[PDB]
Design a protein around this ligand. Structure first.
Ligand SMILES: [K+]
Ligand code: NA
Ligand code: NA
Ligand code: NA
Length: 99
């Protein structure tokens, strides 16, 4: 029920990150506070078509930016975070707003 009013993109993303089957491509990271895409190219070819019906990483990242996700960088893989996108906490998803 936490997903009714959540944009379909975000609901689908959260479920994708949660799904254990897809951890080889995309996983929770930083104690569930961020998520990690292990290889942009592999992810865009093998995950984006099934889950989002396209194969374009820059368009997926543009949607992340639209909802206020940011990149996590060390002081290829890419890591993103949003304060209301967290492991086992889909009750927070309704807080995520568009630009
Ligand atoms: K996953
Ligand atoms: Na951003
Ligand atoms: Na996050
Ligand atoms: Na969440």
């Amino acid at each position: 029920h936490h997903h009714h009013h959540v944009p379909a993109f975000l609901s689908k993303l959260w479920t994708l990150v949660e799904e254990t089957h897809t951890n080889e491509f995309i996983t929770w990271s930083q104690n569930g506070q961020s998520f990690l895409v292990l290889d942009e190219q592999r992810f865009a070819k093998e995950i984006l078509p099934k889950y989002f019906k396209h194969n374009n990483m820059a368009s997926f990242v543009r949607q992340l930016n639209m909802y206020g996700f940011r990149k996590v960088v060390h002081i290829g893989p890419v890591e993103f975070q949003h304060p209301y996108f967290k492991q086992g906490q889909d009750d927070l998803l309704e807080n995520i707003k568009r630009k």
